Design a binder for this molecule. Structure first.
Ligand SMILES: CN1CCC[C@H]1c1cccnc1
Lengths: 215, 210
């Protein structure tokens, strides 16, 4: 059970600073190089750097050396990443990985952290406007528009309609996120029995219930 | 500086597929210590190869690394359906590691399914806020490569739209959403709205008129 539990991420104001932690468990942290890699919303993987077991060697992607400081505390089996003067371009999921020296023959980035998200934005906590989406079987849905920050949770009829439900990934637009959730139901129960979507936005401490009715 | 991989490759299970990894800085040599990382849905990354041709213990034997000409290679033989995934290569240059852009590998492990498309108009509640969002839900298509075009009175829309990247449904098919956000002025200035979903050469249209 190699565990790489990361923490310290979240919302940070542009120009601000953050320090990410990667707590290693289940292996000898002191015989292993460790790295940091980030994956932005739509782009692929970008290497940040890596650190010696004894921090005698520290490597960085050249263009990032001045914005990031990698470090480790073998006493706490933990790896650190300091971010400074962050811009919106620095929004991404940040991963720590173990770069294990297999058999003293080759390195391999085997075990990866789940990832911690870093969102660089000046935007404020904005609750979602929930809108009903309606015109054989019938396709209904809910538009969960303009919330910040992520996440929001969606269910149908309080988590009873689980068949036919498709909740899609969020999109970003004007600093605000949006997503949708659809449910395909037999044309008999709609209209008929009632379909209502249940949106939850913890950050704003908001929950909304909206019923789908024909235009 | 720039490591390049095929953007996408398609194979069928049991076949052999080879992903390559080229470098702007010259030929790829064993001194670049090519690494291969797999990404599966839910941002799950696992190291496949290190040192160009060494398989990380626990990785199925059908994965192997090598060099081919001036490039590093990832070869999958007897490709399984579970190998549909994204594969990143990473090359070492003395003091930093550079990841390729990634290869989205499609392993045809399901019969081709055409996308089910639904176009919702803006809700009356949203119009009261003077904005109009059309929502195009795209579901139950395989393979998970679709392109989405929006037409307003017949003009290809090029801004004001956000399209979700295909997401793996429970049936192992793929789904996606597309939005067209208009001002209420724009919504009332035009009358014909259509969401076009192109999947494996054929195009599906859903449309509506104000
Ligand atoms: C482990 N680091 C020092 C020598 C090679 C380098 C490295 C980084 C990532 C993958 N393989 C090797």
């Amino acid at each position: 059970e190699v565990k790489l539990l990361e923490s310290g991420g979240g919302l940070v104001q542009p120009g601000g600073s953050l320090k990410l932690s990667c707590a290693a468990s289940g292996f000898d942290f002191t015989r292993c190089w460790m790295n940091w890699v980030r994956q932005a919303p739509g782009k692929g993987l970008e290497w940040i750097g890596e650190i010696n077991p004894d921090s005698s060697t520290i490597y960085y992607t050249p263009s990032l050396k001045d914005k990031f400081i990698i470090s480790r505390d073998n006493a706490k089996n933990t790896l650190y990443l300091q971010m400074s003067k962050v811009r919106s371009e620095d929004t991404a999921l940040y991963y720590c990985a173990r770069v294990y020296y297999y058999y003293d023959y080759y390195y391999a980035m085997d075990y990866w952290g789940q990832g911690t998200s870093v969102t660089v934005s000046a935007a404020k906590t904005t609750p979602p406007s929930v809108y009903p989406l309606a015109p054989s079987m019938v396709t209904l849905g809910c538009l969960v528009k303009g919330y910040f920050p992520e996440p929001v949770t969606v269910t149908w009829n309080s988590g009873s309609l689980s068949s036919g439900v498709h909740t899609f990934p969020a999109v970003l637009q004007s600093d605000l996120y949006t997503l949708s959730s659809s449910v395909t139901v037999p044309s008999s129960p709609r209209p008929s029995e009632t379909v209502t979507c249940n949106v939850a936005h913890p950050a704003s401490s908001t929950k909304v219930d909206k019923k789908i009715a024909a235009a | 500086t720039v490591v390049t991989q095929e953007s996408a490759l398609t194979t069928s299970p049991g076949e052999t597929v080879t992903l390559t990894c080229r470098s702007s800085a010259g030929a790829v040599t064993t001194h670049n210590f090519a690494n291969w990382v797999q990404e599966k849905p839910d941002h799950l990354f696992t190291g496949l190869i290190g040192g160009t041709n060494n398989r990380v213990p626990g990785v199925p034997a059908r994965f192997s690394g090598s060099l081919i000409g001036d490039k590093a290679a990832l070869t999958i033989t007897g490709t399984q359906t579970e190998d549909e995934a994204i594969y990143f290569c990473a090359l070492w240059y003395s003091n930093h590691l550079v990841f390729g852009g990634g290869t989205k590998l499609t392993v045809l492990g399901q019969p081709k399914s055409s996308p089910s498309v639904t176009l919702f108009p803006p809700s009356s509640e949203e119009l009261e806020t003077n904005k109009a969002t059309l929502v195009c839900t795209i579901t139950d298509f395989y393979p998970g490569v679709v392109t989405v075009d929006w037409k307003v009175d017949g003009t290809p829309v090029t801004q004001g739209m956000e399209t979700t990247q295909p997401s793996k449904q429970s049936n192992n098919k793929y789904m996606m959403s597309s939005y067209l956000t208009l001002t209420a002025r724009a919504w009332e200035r035009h009358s014909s709205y259509s969401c076009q979903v192109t999947h494996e050469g054929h195009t599906v249209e859903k449309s509506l008129s104000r």
